[PDB]
Design a protein around this ligand. Structure first.
Ligand SMILES: Nc1ncnc2c1ncn2[C@@H]1O[C@H](COP(=O)(O)OP(=O)(O)O)[C@@H](O)[C@H]1O
Ligand SMILES: Nc1ncnc2c1ncn2[C@@H]1O[C@H](COP(=O)(O)OP(=O)(O)O)[C@@H](O)[C@H]1O
Lengths: 753, 131
């Protein structure tokens, strides 16, 4: 039977299109743009237009939610496709809306909604279906009651439509498309993949699972900063896979008076067990099961014990899956993390720039944007925000846009008009104002993400590039040879050299090339964990680093220990070596299998304690020479590529003359040249207004001399006070520290075979 | 590292628990690597952790003195710099015998190489004795 296939999530937004792989396209002898009949459970037939896609496999058919709700199927089910080239044109229809999507509209639904949807679309329709059309501010779904010929027809330019009639009620089989799905979550692809992997089988196929006879998961923890959307993930999984999502609040259970709180929780478990494969969601777990020290009273201990007993009472035969949500995994009582209880942990981190882009894209599907929208710029500008903050941003930007023009539009008394809520186009002046008034919530948190520095950003340093590529990329690409050759991969690299030579840029670039998460730790943070507590502050950092493998952990200014300890203070030495001791302790304990790479940076290598420089620990040392007249041309090109360049270019005396410059002074030279250019531009502008204030209409046109330009004069006014960032004496001491190893390397003569 | 970890905060609990664990699992060969670490640490500019150093050394001395000779629990310590260590340890009833470990030379080195390069590949070309 070459008809049965399995449904999967699609990518195209158009409702009446599906994606097929080329071999199934060829075998079924179907062409592009035709109509095919689809059937599934409950004897539901749908019409759709075939579209090509190589990404999907042969058995995998890609199809979006509205067609799925038409077919009354779910993900992973079985559907069959049959050819249907005999569909004909159409006639009188009686399209009608549903009541709970039209309340307070009172407008020309024909012109506003159906006309744009059916214009140059040629979308086939079938009797008895539900289709959703996007419009002004809300989501509107319409239903067909009859057509001619029945049931199949294709909407044609020459047909008669009627959108006149009282709204109908719900079909009473739910199928509400306004609920959540997999398309309403963005920026959490890997975590959603893990959840689908570990939850889909016990819920979709219980009989086969109990036939195999293997232990299913009994608990999942989701921990992260508040507002990242854990409840959304639970609701989406429960709705899409098919379950009886039952929510238990923390504070609501806590404040139920007397010793009656336990009765409600027990009733909740007993009621969930007796219905169907369910997903009990315990919100704010730390509110009812805190640390032992915080439980001053006695009712809290009784509640926690009741929870533990009920959780243990999940003997073999049980399709109930318990999911819990919490903040950082230190408030939870340790006894809950045994085996049988909550054991799996999934980390829902703060979204990065790309994730912010998908969040913004999702939240503005309804809104009528203008042509001035630059959402990628806003995403690049909004670092430090979570999902809820971006939703609020979009909402109040829409409110600002409607407020700006409200007297002129019809305020009516009770309803709106469809037409008036269509010229509403939010613009960038609204979004800039929206950003101006908004307080981010995350801010002071460690952020892990893929750095955006590309190899072309850094100039020169080919030897160091080769060494890094050998050291980090090789062990994870061809593992068998390492095991078969005795060689056991290296752990970390320590950098040293004059300051400002670009160690951090190189670390970020290698992390980007290796395609792994990057986490950066600064000296001030190390000083902070110096003065006070140094136990956990070196614990959760390593826990997060190991959890998000593959990773490239970067330690910056590791020499601040000796930089601050050395001197007349001497009293901070205890808390000082506390930090280095912790680093050694949890860096000598990491498993060799884990692909967690540690990189150190320093500029005064002689004063670093030699305990770190031992085999097994950070051992390889790479010397970063101070760039001199070989490569500064590339550095100048790299940091002047973004600016509107210049005429006559440097390529010459500008680079040639300087000998012994780091990158910092070159960057500040570029900044000062651009500052002089801006000063000249603004002075010319101010002169223009100070001249035209006493003049009549002078055919004022775009002539304002606004074209950016940074000629040789600006550079001349720049290198008149540049300073040598690195002193000459530093080179001597750094090269002597290198000479220690090189003279230890003195014996290198080729001996007899 | 563990010695210094139980040198910057508490000093008593860890020594008691480690000696109890060693005693209960007899016979065993307890090992104290880098016994000179504390002396190296407090021999510099740092001069505040000396009280905890007294604490650690006193614990080690006390729960060596309290060990019954019938129980079979040895103690072995290795120090890089012997002179600066506490001379109270090198007393009868404590670490007494001193064994000097020289730098391997010539005939020992070829055996060192033979032991190391067992690995999985071979070196049938170069002569180990020459190197
Ligand atoms: N793709 C998304 N990722 C994260 N958050 C989202 C996304 N889409 C919407 N949100 C917002 O996240 C909010 C989740 O609220 P809430 O249940 O308080 O999250 P949590 O319980 O995880 O703190 C919703 O109000 C929604 O507006
Ligand atoms: N291609 C380049 N090579 C060297 N330095 C650069 C390059 N491009 C930019 N820089 C400058 O070098 C700085 C990197 O500083 P960093 O290497 O972290 O200092 P340190 O070496 O003291 O840790 C950046 O601020 C940047 O201005």
């Amino acid at each position: 039977r070459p008809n049965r296939l399995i449904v999967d999530e699609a990518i195209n937004e158009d409702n009446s299109v599906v994606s097929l792989s080329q071999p199934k396209m060829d075998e079924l002898q179907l062409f592009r743009g035709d109509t095919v009949l689809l059937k599934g459970k409950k004897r539901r037939e749908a019409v759709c237009i075939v579209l090509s896609d190589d990404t999907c496999s042969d058995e995998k058919i890609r199809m979006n939610r509205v067609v799925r709700n038409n077919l009354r199927v779910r993900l992973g089910d079985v559907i069959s496709i049959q050819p249907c080239p005999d569909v004909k044109y159409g006639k009188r229809i009686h399209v009608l809306p549903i009541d709970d999507t039209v309340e307070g509209i009172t407008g020309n639904l024909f012109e506003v909604y159906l006309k744009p949807y059916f214009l140059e679309a040629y979308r086939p329709i079938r009797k008895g279906d539900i289709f959703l059309v996007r419009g002004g501010m809300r989501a509107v779904e319409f239903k067909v009651v009859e057509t001619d010929p029945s049931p199949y027809c294709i909407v044609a330019p020459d047909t008669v439509i009627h959108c006149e009639g009282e709204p109908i009620k719900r079909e009473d089989e739910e199928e509400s498309l306004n609920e959540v799905g997999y398309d309403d979550i963005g920026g959490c692809r890997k975590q959603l993949a893990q959840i689908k992997e570990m939850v889909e089988l016990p819920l979709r196929h219980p009989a086969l699972f109990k036939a195999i006879g293997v232990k299913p998961p009994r608990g999942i923890l989701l921990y992260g900063p508040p507002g990242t959307g854990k409840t959304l993930i639970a609701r989406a999984v429960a709705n899409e896979t098919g379950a009886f999502f039952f929510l238990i609040n923390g504070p609501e259970i806590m404040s139920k008076l007397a010793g009656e709180s336990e009765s409600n929780l027990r009733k909740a478990f007993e009621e969930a067990e007796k219905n169907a494969p369910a997903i009990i969601f315990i919100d704010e777990l730390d509110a009812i099961a805190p640390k032992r020290e915080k439980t001053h009273g006695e009712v809290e201990r009784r509640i926690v014990s009741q929870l533990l007993t009920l959780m243990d009472g999940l003997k073999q035969r049980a399709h109930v899956i318990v999911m819990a949500a919490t903040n950082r995994p230190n408030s939870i009582d340790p006894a809950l993390r045994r085996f049988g209880r909550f054991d799996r942990e999934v980390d829902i981190g703060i979204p990065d720039a790309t994730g912010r882009l998908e969040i913004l894209q999702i939240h503005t599907k309804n809104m009528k944007l203008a042509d001035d929208v630059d959402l990628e710029q806003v995403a690049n500008e909004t670092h430090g925000h979570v999902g809820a903050d971006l939703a609020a941003l979009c909402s109040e930007a829409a409110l600002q846009a409607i407020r700006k023009k409200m007297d002129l539009i019809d305020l009516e008394d009770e309803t709106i008009d469809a037409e008036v809520m269509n010229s509403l186009a939010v613009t960038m002046d609204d979004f800039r104002w929206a950003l101006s008034q908004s307080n981010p919530s995350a801010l002071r948190e460690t952020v892990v993400e893929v750095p955006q520095v590309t190899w072309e950003d850094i100039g020169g340093l080919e030897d160091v590039k080769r060494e890094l590529q050998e050291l980090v990329q090789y062990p994870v690409e061809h593992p068998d040879k390492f095991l078969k050759f005795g060689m056991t991969p290296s752990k970390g690299v320590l950098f040293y050299g004059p300051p400002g030579c670009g160690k951090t840029l190189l670390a970020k670039a290698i992390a980007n090339e290796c395609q792994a998460n990057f986490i950066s730790i600064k000296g001030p943070e190390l000083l902070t964990m110096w003065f006070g507590e140094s136990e956990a502050n070196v614990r959760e950092i390593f826990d997060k680093a190991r959890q998000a493998a593959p990773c490239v952990l970067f330690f910056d200014e590791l020499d601040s220990i000796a930089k601050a300890r050395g001197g007349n203070i001497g009293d901070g030495g205890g808390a000082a070596d506390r930090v280095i001791n912790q680093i050694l302790t949890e860096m000598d304990g990491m498993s060799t299998k884990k692909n967690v790479f540690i990189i150190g940076a320093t500029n005064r290598p002689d004063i670093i304690d030699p305990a770190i420089l031992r085999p097994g620990r950070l051992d390889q040392l790479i010397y970063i020479p101070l760039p001199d007249e070989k490569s500064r041309v590339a550095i100048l090109k790299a940091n002047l590529r973004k600016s509107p360049v210049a005429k006559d270019v440097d390529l010459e005396f500008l680079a040639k003359m300087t000998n012994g410059f780091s990158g910092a002074d070159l960057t500040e030279i570029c900044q000062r040249a651009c500052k002089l250019a801006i000063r000249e531009s603004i002075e010319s502008e101010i002169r223009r207004e100070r001249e035209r204030q006493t003049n009549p209409s002078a055919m004022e046109v775009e002539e304002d001399d606004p074209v950016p330009e940074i000629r040789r004069d600006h550079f001349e006014e720049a290198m008149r006070f540049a300073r040598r960032s690195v002193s000459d004496n530093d080179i001597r001491k750094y090269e002597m520290f290198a000479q220690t190893l090189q003279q230890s390397r003195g014996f290198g003569s080729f001996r007899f075979p």
